[PDB]
Amino acid sequence: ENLYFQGMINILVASEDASRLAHLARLVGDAGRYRVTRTVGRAAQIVQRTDGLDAFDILMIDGAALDTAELAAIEKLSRLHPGLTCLLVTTDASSQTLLDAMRAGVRDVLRWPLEPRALDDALKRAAAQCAQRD
Amino acid sequence: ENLYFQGMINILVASEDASRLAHLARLVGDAGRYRVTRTVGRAAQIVQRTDGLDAFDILMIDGAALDTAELAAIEKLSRLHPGLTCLLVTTDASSQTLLDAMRAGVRDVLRWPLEPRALDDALKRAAAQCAQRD
Ligand SMILES: [Cl-]
Ligand SMILES: [Cl-]
Ligand SMILES: [Cl-]
Ligand SMILES: [Cl-]
């Protein structure tokens, strides 16, 4: 019941798997007019592109193999990019991973297989968290 | 192994119970030189003080009775105050409450009874998320 100008929202979709990446990006593209960018990189490689990251409002990470090194990288990532909202897509809603995500700066956790209604709700919440980028 | 100037950090501690409030504030005061402010108000009353809230870096909420109205209030609170880090202190680490907190903008969930090491870790993480206040 709260609309945001979707075309104004830059989403970075990150996954190691070509098929999952294409599917995640296709699902975001179906949810609204959000400007979607794809990457095959891991959170530890993404952090190294400080200027490039500044252009995004949302970072949707596929959490296939959550390691302590990647949680630390996501922590470094949300720390240096407070304007960036990190969403984690996983196949595990166990308390430990949910709490580890939160402590790494994640704002939402989405269940895989991803659901249109769930995604649209997630994106509506993340649109509300968007700040002006210069 | 990453230090922040604790005296520079303004913490608002919120609880309905006089005894819990005093105990939470005493525990924060023992964790470091953080400037601590106490309130008996609920998240729905706190949101109404926009200018006052701007002065805080951290909001530690006692989550004794988490209602949908208060999660919405915390959502409104983190939405209008992106510089404010909300920590929730509860006696329930169930996935549903953990995920509901995250979707309401909470950055960390602490277990009651509160533990010094846990708190010091939580506060160190929240210090890293502090942004310049004007
Ligand atoms: Cl790429
Ligand atoms: Cl760069
Ligand atoms: Cl008071
Ligand atoms: Cl005010």
TrEMBL record, chains A, B:
Segments forming domain Response regulatory: 10-127
Residues annotated with 4-aspartylphosphate modification: D62
Organism: Burkholderia pseudomallei (strain K96243)
Residues included from the entire protein: 1 to 127 of 402
Protein name (database record): Pilus assembly-related protein
Domain of life of the native organism: Bacteria
